[PDB]
Amino acid sequence: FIVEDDESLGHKELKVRKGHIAKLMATEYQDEYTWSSLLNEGLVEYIDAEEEESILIAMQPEDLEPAEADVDPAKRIRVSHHATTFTHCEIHPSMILGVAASIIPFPDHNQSPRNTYQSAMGKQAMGVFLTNYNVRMDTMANILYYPQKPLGTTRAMEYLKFRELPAGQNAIVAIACYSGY
Amino acid sequence: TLSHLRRTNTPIGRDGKLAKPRQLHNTHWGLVCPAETPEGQACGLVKNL
């Protein structure tokens, strides 16, 4: 996301605006203003590692843009945006992740490595790998009898088609000691 | 399958279990996943976009 302080009406600010947005969700319900649009309308550009070196970035679009004029003792604890030179904003942090991790619920609540582990196991889980399993003649293949889309989810699964072709089941779980088995 | 199509490799110089590369680099932010890398042997040498 580009920042360009170029706002007559005030300080610095994300090129893209609530209009562009609603203009896309407009193209959504139609299933003519795509991604390649946001791009050619110099509202968002590609940054490789080299270039990235010479730019400043904001995490949240909002939280890192207004001035100052309490806080929830339950939410985490963010630092601040006492920066003025902001040249770009992060479309969203969660995208630092990959296909594996994007299915981990609340990864920002686990011990770093545990997420590395789960990232490995899901590639050994069972589910439905393609709806045409019935017509494919591959050696060895596993289909879960009754796939269930997971209760707790991720905005990113939405693109990994995970709700469509799940890979597990919502099991009722008791975390207790019992027979000792 | 998705995860397999976004896979990265990196050869080494034998022995080279040195960790200078294997380590999660700063610049890796945003381009590679900080959590999804294999354990042991080729850990850190195999990244995921």
Partner: peptide
């Protein structure tokens, strides 16, 4: 106000749009 700021939930829209055009296997194809 088609030119107001953008909240957080609004970013998802951009993304929804990203994958609609590029898609998960982008690079392996291009």
């Amino acid at each position: 106000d088609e030119s107001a700021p953008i909240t957080a939930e609004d970013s998802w829209a951009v993304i929804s749009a990203f994958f609609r055009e590029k898609g998960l296997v982008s690079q392996q194809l291009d």
